[PDB]
């Protein structure tokens, strides 16, 4: 049955959460390759700050390294270690423009 | 230390996962209101199918209802029950 207000708010306030990021989006210079898997599970700042004049952005960043299969058509494949940026702590901040 | 290939693949294959959806995106006709919270945690089909000719889409859908504060400036506020679409099972399909 129904999820109460206080639960929804707390679970949907700006915090780091497991997000599925496409590898291409992160490394766009690496186009020769086909990546398996094509995306990876990273912690990224999502959720809402409950104000149009504020955005949810990271403060504490870190790195995580994942074994990724990198296929290079008509050439060869291999398991390469690829590093990805993660978010450890998020905060609500003003939109700069 | 390093996450192995088989773990990354399995965790990043098309499956339903907790995604944070903006309420406006779901109900765009309701513009008079300001929603608190402005977004909600729903299960939606994410992840990759590992093929450019395929996309990850839902098969089994369901509904979940959440108490949301709906402010209507210079008028009044209230806790209204708002329904949202969820995904229970995903499958890889052609575009």
């Amino acid at each position, epitope marked *: 049955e129904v999820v109460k*207000f*206080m639960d929804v*708010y707390q679970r949907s306030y700006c915090h780091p959460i497991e997000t599925l990021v496409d590898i291409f989006q992160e490394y766009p210079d690496e186009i020769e390759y086909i990546f398996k898997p094509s995306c990876v599970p990273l912690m990224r700042c999502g959720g809402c700050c*409950n*104000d149009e004049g504020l955005e949810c952005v990271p403060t504490e960043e870190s790195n995580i390294t994942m074994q990724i299969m990198r296929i290079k058509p008509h050439q060869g494949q291999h398991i390469g270690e690829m590093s990805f940026l993660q978010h450890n702590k998020c905060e609500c901040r003003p939109k700069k423009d | 230390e390093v996450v192995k290939f088989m773990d990354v693949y399995q965790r990043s294959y098309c499956h339903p996962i907790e995604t944070l959806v903006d309420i406006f995106q779901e109900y765009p006709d309701e513009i008079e209101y*300001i929603f*608190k919270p402005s977004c909600v945690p729903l299960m939606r089909c994410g992840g990759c199918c590992n093929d450019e000719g395929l996309e990850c889409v839902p098969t089994e859908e369901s509904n979940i209802t959440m108490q949301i*504060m709906r*402010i209507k*400036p*210079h*008028q*009044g*506020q*209230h*806790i*209204g029950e708002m329904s949202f679409l969820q995904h229970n099972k995903c499958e890889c399909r052609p575009k």
Partner: antibody
Amino acid sequence: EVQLVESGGGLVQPGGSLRLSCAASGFNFSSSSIHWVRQAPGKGLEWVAYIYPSYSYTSYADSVKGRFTISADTSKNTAYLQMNSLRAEDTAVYYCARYYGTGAMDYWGQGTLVTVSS
Amino acid sequence: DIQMTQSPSSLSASVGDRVTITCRASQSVSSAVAWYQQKPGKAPKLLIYSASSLYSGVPSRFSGSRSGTDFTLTISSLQPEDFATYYCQQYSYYYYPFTFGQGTKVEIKR
């Protein structure tokens, strides 16, 4: 010209009932909402209860919940606070105030004095 | 419950002096705070809302400001008719719709 007017406060025996009336003028009381706020002698301001007639939504403060009842006659352009089972602590000055952007109160009533004593 | 804690409790200043009333929130309220002015024997009058914006018809000397939890009403040129009790008020729905502080009785020095 906007104004809120309250009435019906006075002396009541503990455990007694007492009904407060907040009479709106100069705005569509249908298309807006009202707070009740009370202020005990010397002490500061405390939220009692709230109503938003358009969506028949109503909410009360814990210390009051179950004992008071907010209503509103949209026809009469009037809000009511029905107070049952009054205690010594319920002695206060009762203000109704109409609701401003995203919270806050812009227009307040003159305020009626409810005094619970035997 | 969200606790709004006003400082000081009472306060006297001279005519024309700068007066600073602070109001400290327990947990983040956002910019959802209002300041009121209650004369003796009358109802509160709204001065500031959304922490910083001035209500229509309030003289300019009254000015609200913020520091991520510490909210601050500032009367820039105190005047004898500013003698009053000043209340901060937080909203942002959490459990209650809003909450007040204990007040700040201002006085005039002459």
